[PDB]
Design a protein around this ligand. Structure first.
Ligand SMILES: [Cl-]
Ligand code: NA
Lengths: 205, 201
């Protein structure tokens, strides 16, 4: 998907199949304003002579889709099966693409950075309650935090050490085999990333 | 209330007596050893991360006062370690060899800092205030790690050097008859950086 300057959204389609044309596929599109459908439709996967042939590509101009003046506007196109097969239902998706059509963002205006004051800490702020500056509740429920975390439960890949690591060198060197190194998990545990401690330096109104 | 004593890198403060020998003298003396009133706090009062460590209404250093409600406090033998002989009631020993059990960020220590408050009432003979006595000395032969001392509500000083002796001049704080000694002891302090021996903490 692309939006040529002053143009309308343009969909590039390639049939990368070995033999079958795209007559079994329908291209469905929808535009959503902050996730709510604003418009939608269907087009066929057509080439220069009927259904787009195996190995053929085409480009199609979709309807104009002006941005919502507020919030985000997203176009989604999906290739789906027109008809059920023995193994999938009618409308089974094959793959999809999106394009951001949103009007230039209005970033919300954040509060000015403020100088700390002497004296008493607030005990409550909006939905939050604090006990000597420590969060104890949000919106009627007991809550603690926030607490910095650098640890994640190592994935099986995070635990692997067969290929080398890519960090220490140009990854294109050494046939892309990396540089011999311990697993991520090993270095994370050696650095104590799983057992960070929190020390309060200061608290101020 | 100033709790910079906890991270101070100096030798200790207050009414310090010049270092001398441990001697067998016939001077009048008494042992304050015995069962003292004790409580364990999880953090050092008055530090930025300990905003609600103390009971409602208690001031940062209100434990020093002669007017203090310690009725409900447990007792602990002195000398002892609070992490020994108590079936884990006040925590357990921690063994490291080389590694420090806290971040290497001198002179800062963790917020989780077991802090023991000790309160001891004792009697001093009227005769110790007669002109035959020049001064009254309070001696600690070993406290792990840093501690602050109050006598009859008056701050006497702060000690460091866990296996080193420290004497304080309590001539002006003591009285004949009944007296109060209050000692606040922190597990971790700036002194912990100087005390990384291969042994149990
Ligand atoms: Cl922590
Ligand atoms: Na050690």
């Amino acid at each position: 998907l692309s939006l040529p300057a002053g143009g309308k959204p343009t969909l590039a389609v390639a049939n990368l199949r070995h033999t079958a044309d795209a007559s079994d596929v329908v291209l469905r599109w929808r535009v959503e304003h902050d996730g709510a459908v604003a418009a939608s439709g269907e087009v066929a996967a057509e080439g220069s002579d009927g259904p787009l042939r195996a190995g053929e590509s085409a480009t199609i101009a979709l309807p104009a889709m002006p941005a919502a003046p507020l919030g985000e506007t997203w176009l989604t196109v999906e290739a789906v099966l027109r008809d059920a097969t023995g193994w999938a239902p009618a409308g089974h998706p094959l793959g999809a693409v999106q394009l951001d059509l949103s009007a230039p963002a209005v970033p919300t205006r954040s509060p000015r950075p403020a100088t700390p004051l002497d004296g008493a800490l607030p005990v409550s702020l909006g939905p939050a309650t604090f006990d000597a500056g420590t969060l104890v509740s949000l919106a009627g429920q007991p809550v603690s935090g926030p607490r910095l975390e650098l640890w994640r439960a190592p994935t099986d890949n995070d635990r692997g050490a067969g290929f080398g690591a890519y960090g220490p060198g140009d990854p294109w060197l050494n046939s892309g085999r990396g540089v011999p190194a311990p697993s991520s998990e090993a270095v994370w545990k050696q650095a104590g990333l799983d057992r960070l401690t929190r020390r309060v330096e200061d608290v101020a109104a | 209330a100033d709790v910079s004593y906890l991270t101070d890198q100096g030798p200790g403060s207050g009414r310090r007596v010049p270092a001398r020998s441990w001697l067998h003298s016939d001077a009048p003396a008494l042992s304050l050893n015995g069962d003292w009133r004790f409580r364990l706090l999880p953090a050092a009062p008055g530090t930025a991360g300990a905003g609600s460590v103390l009971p409602s209404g208690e001031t940062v250093e209100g434990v020093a006062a002669e007017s203090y409600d310690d009725a409900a406090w447990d007792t602990l033998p002195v000398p002892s370690h609070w992490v020994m002989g108590q079936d884990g009631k006040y925590g357990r020993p921690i063994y490291t060899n080389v590694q420090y059990p806290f971040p290497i960020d001198p002179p800062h220590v963790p917020d989780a800092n077991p802090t023991g408050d000790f309160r001891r009432r004792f009697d001093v003979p009227a005769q110790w205030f007669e002109s035959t006595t020049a001064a009254l000395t309070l001696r600690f032969d070993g406290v792990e790690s840093r501690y602050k001392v109050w006598v009859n509500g008056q701050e006497i000083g702060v000690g460091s050097g866990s296996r080193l002796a420290q004497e304080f001049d309590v001539s002006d704080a003591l009285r004949a008859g009944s007296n109060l000694l209050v000692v606040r002891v922190h597990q971790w302090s700036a002194a912990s950086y100087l005390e990384d021996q291969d042994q149990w903490w």
